UniProtKB/Swiss-Prot annotation, chain A:
Domain of life per record: Eukaryota
Miscellaneous: Binding of [3H]ryanodine indicates that the heterozygous channel is activated by Ca(2+) concentrations 4-fold lower than normal. Single-cell analysis of cotransfected cells shows a significantly increased resting cytoplasmic Ca(2+) level and a significantly reduced luminal Ca(2+) level.
Gene coding for it: RYR1
Compartment(s) where it occurs, according to its Swiss-Prot or TrEMBL record: Sarcoplasmic reticulum membrane
Residue sites binding caffeine per the record: W18
Function: Cytosolic calcium-activated calcium channel that mediates the release of Ca(2+) from the sarcoplasmic reticulum into the cytosol and thereby plays a key role in triggering muscle contraction following depolarization of T-tubules. Repeated very high-level exercise increases the open probability of the channel and leads to Ca(2+) leaking into the cytoplasm. Can also mediate the release of Ca(2+) from intracellular stores in neurons, and may thereby promote prolonged Ca(2+) signaling in the brain. Required for normal embryonic development of muscle fibers and skeletal muscle.
Protein name: Ryanodine receptor 1
Portion of the parent chain present: 4699 to 4747 of 5037
UniProt note: domains: The calcium release channel activity resides in the C-terminal region while the remaining part of the protein constitutes the 'foot' structure spanning the junctional gap between the sarcoplasmic reticulum (SR) and the T-tubule. Pore opening is mediated via the cytoplasmic calcium-binding domains that mediate a small rotation of the channel-forming transmembrane regions that then leads to channel opening.
Tissue distribution: Detected in skeletal muscle (at protein level). Fast- or slow-twitch skeletal muscle.
Assembly: Homotetramer. Can also form heterotetramers with RYR2. Identified in a complex composed of RYR1, PDE4D, PKA, FKBP1A and protein phosphatase 1 (PP1). Repeated very high-level exercise decreases interaction with PDE4D and protein phosphatase 1 (PP1). Interacts with CALM; CALM with bound calcium inhibits the RYR1 channel activity. Interacts with S100A1. Interacts with FKBP1A; this stabilizes the closed conformation of the channel. Interacts with CACNA1S; interaction with CACNA1S is important for activation of the RYR1 channel. Interacts with CACNB1.
Record PTM: The N-terminus is blocked.
Taxonomic lineage: Eukaryota, Metazoa, Chordata, Craniata, Vertebrata
Family: Belongs to the ryanodine receptor (TC 1.A.3.1) family. RYR1 subfamily.
Length: 49, 48
């Protein structure tokens, strides 16, 4: 459950899974009431703006 | 609810913890699940 922590940042994470909108989805759901830049540094997503 | 919240404690500009009024202004409209009418009303209720 910690070894997966070191792959959240990369863009190649949702490789074989199909719906690769995932980062946008979590940003839409939880990013509003949290640091959207906290998302855009934790989950990669460089220059979310 | 907002006691101990991270996005309320983000703007607690007081080492002593007897914090200002506008910490509650900034750290609860920046943070959601509140509303500016409640903000200004609460600081109306608060001891200035």
């Amino acid at each position: 459950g910690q070894w997966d922590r070191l792959v959240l940042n990369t863009p190649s994470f949702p490789s074989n899974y199909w719906d690769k909108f995932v980062k946008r989805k979590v940003l839409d759901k939880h990013g509003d009431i949290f640091g959207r830049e906290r998302i855009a540094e934790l989950l990669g997503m460089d220059l979310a703006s | 609810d907002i006691v101990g919240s991270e996005a309320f404690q983000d703007y607690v500009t007081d080492p002593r913890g007897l914090i200002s009024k506008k910490d509650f202004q900034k750290a609860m409209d920046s943070q959601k699940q509140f509303t500016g009418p409640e903000i200004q009303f609460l600081l109306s209720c608060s001891e200035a």
